[PDB]
Amino acid sequence: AGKETIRQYLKNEIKKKGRKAVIAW
Numbered sequence: 001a002g003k004e005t006i007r008q009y010l011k012n013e014i015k016k017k018g019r020k021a022v023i024a025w
Contacts, residue, residue, distance in 0.1 A: 002009020018024065 001007060012021070014020075016022075016025075
């Protein structure tokens with residue numbers, strides 16, 4: 001869980017694909 005909030009949840013294991021969750025959805 002991202003309770004380690006950096007578990008990789010800070011990256012969603014994707015950075016949502018590169019923080020794309022805005023660097024490009």
